[PDB]
Design an enzyme around this catalytic site. Structure first.
Site, PDB file in Angstrom:
ATOM      1  N   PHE A 150      -8.553  -6.266   3.569  1.00 24.48           N
ATOM      2  CA  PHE A 150      -8.124  -4.895   3.719  1.00 24.48           C
ATOM      3  C   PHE A 150      -8.297  -4.198   2.391  1.00 24.48           C
ATOM      4  O   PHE A 150      -8.960  -3.198   2.208  1.00 24.48           O
ATOM      5  CB  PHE A 150      -6.640  -4.867   4.065  1.00 24.48           C
ATOM      6  CG  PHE A 150      -6.107  -3.483   4.418  1.00 24.48           C
ATOM      7  CD1 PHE A 150      -5.636  -2.618   3.432  1.00 24.48           C
ATOM      8  CD2 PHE A 150      -5.894  -3.101   5.751  1.00 24.48           C
ATOM      9  CE1 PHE A 150      -5.011  -1.406   3.760  1.00 24.48           C
ATOM     10  CE2 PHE A 150      -5.333  -1.872   6.111  1.00 24.48           C
ATOM     11  CZ  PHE A 150      -4.880  -1.020   5.100  1.00 24.48           C
ATOM     12  N   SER A 160     -12.630 -19.979  -4.496  1.00 24.52           N
ATOM     13  CA  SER A 160     -11.283 -20.044  -3.941  1.00 24.52           C
ATOM     14  C   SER A 160     -11.341 -20.257  -2.446  1.00 24.52           C
ATOM     15  O   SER A 160     -10.455 -20.808  -1.840  1.00 24.52           O
ATOM     16  CB  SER A 160     -10.540 -18.766  -4.221  1.00 24.52           C
ATOM     17  OG  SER A 160     -11.109 -18.182  -5.354  1.00 24.52           O
ATOM     18  N   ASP A 215      -6.820   6.319  -6.156  1.00 21.90           N
ATOM     19  CA  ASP A 215      -6.282   4.986  -6.127  1.00 21.90           C
ATOM     20  C   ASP A 215      -6.466   4.453  -7.522  1.00 21.90           C
ATOM     21  O   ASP A 215      -7.159   5.106  -8.273  1.00 21.90           O
ATOM     22  CB  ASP A 215      -6.908   4.242  -4.944  1.00 21.90           C
ATOM     23  CG  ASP A 215      -8.313   3.824  -5.219  1.00 21.90           C
ATOM     24  OD1 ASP A 215      -8.872   2.935  -4.610  1.00 21.90           O
ATOM     25  OD2 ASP A 215      -8.852   4.453  -6.223  1.00 21.90           O
ATOM     26  N   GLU A 220       0.790  -1.215   0.000  1.00 21.39           N
ATOM     27  CA  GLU A 220       0.000   0.000   0.000  1.00 21.39           C
ATOM     28  C   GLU A 220       0.853   1.312   0.000  1.00 21.39           C
ATOM     29  O   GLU A 220       0.405   2.451  -0.264  1.00 21.39           O
ATOM     30  CB  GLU A 220      -0.931  -0.007   1.250  1.00 21.39           C
ATOM     31  CG  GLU A 220      -1.843  -1.221   1.322  1.00 21.39           C
ATOM     32  CD  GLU A 220      -3.006  -1.180   0.354  1.00 21.39           C
ATOM     33  OE1 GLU A 220      -3.864  -2.030   0.304  1.00 21.39           O
ATOM     34  OE2 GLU A 220      -3.032  -0.132  -0.409  1.00 21.39           O
ATOM     35  N   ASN A 256      -7.483 -20.209  -9.391  1.00 19.56           N
ATOM     36  CA  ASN A 256      -8.798 -19.643  -9.238  1.00 19.56           C
ATOM     37  C   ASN A 256      -8.712 -18.174  -8.888  1.00 19.56           C
ATOM     38  O   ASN A 256      -9.356 -17.344  -9.490  1.00 19.56           O
ATOM     39  CB  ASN A 256      -9.671 -20.390  -8.207  1.00 19.56           C
ATOM     40  CG  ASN A 256     -11.107 -19.890  -8.249  1.00 19.56           C
ATOM     41  OD1 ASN A 256     -11.583 -19.163  -7.361  1.00 19.56           O
ATOM     42  ND2 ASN A 256     -11.811 -20.281  -9.315  1.00 19.56           N
TER      43      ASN A 256
END
Ligand SMILES: [Cl-]
Ligand SMILES: [Cl-]
Length: 164
Positions: A104, A117, A20, A11, A132
């Site tokens: 997150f 998954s 973003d 991040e 997957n």
């Protein structure tokens, strides 16, 4: 290596409001400000989040408080979520970190729909799950990050993070 180190890696850190890859408004260590287009808005939010007249900019300290708060939240989120919890619980420590990374990143809602998954994770079908995982908007939108995470799930080790 730990979850904080991990996410700090993925991040980055910015003291200024920034968009973003999804165009959205963020700050610090991946702190989502708002899904809408008003800088004024994000700004408001920022101020509200921080409890002071920021003007789009914050201290490292500040970034980290948010960050702290955000990892905490992800974890609880997982722990309270009916689809998430079982996976989590079933996993090993490293792999748990990876889960938390995803939540997150994209939110519990977002992650909870990786239905397949999730199952594969739960059954410890590491290579299939990785495949997957890779068939995702997520992957296509942020490949490199996706890869690190995916690897982590794949290997149960921190290798993808070692060296950066
Ligand atoms: Cl907040
Ligand atoms: Cl990326």
């Amino acid at each position: 290596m730990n979850i904080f180190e991990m996410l700090r890696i993925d991040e980055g850190l910015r003291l200024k409001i920034y968009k973003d890859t999804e165009g959205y408004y963020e700050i610090g260590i991946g702190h989502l400000l708002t899904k809408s287009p008003s800088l004024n808005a994000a700004k408001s939010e920022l101020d509200k989040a921080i409890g002071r007249n920021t003007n789009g900019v914050i201290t490292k300290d500040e970034a980290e408080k948010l960050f702290n708060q955000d990892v905490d939240a992800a974890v609880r989120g997982i722990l309270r979520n009916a689809k998430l919890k079982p996976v989590y619980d079933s996993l090993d420590a490293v792999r748990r970190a990876a889960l938390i990374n995803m939540v997150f990143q994209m939110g519990e809602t977002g992650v909870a729909g990786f239905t397949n998954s999730l199952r594969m994770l739960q059954q410890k079908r590491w290579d299939e799950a990785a495949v997957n995982l890779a068939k995702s908007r997520w992957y296509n939108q942020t490949p490199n990050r996706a890869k690190r995470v995916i690897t982590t799930f794949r290997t149960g080790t921190w290798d993808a993070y070692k060296n950066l």
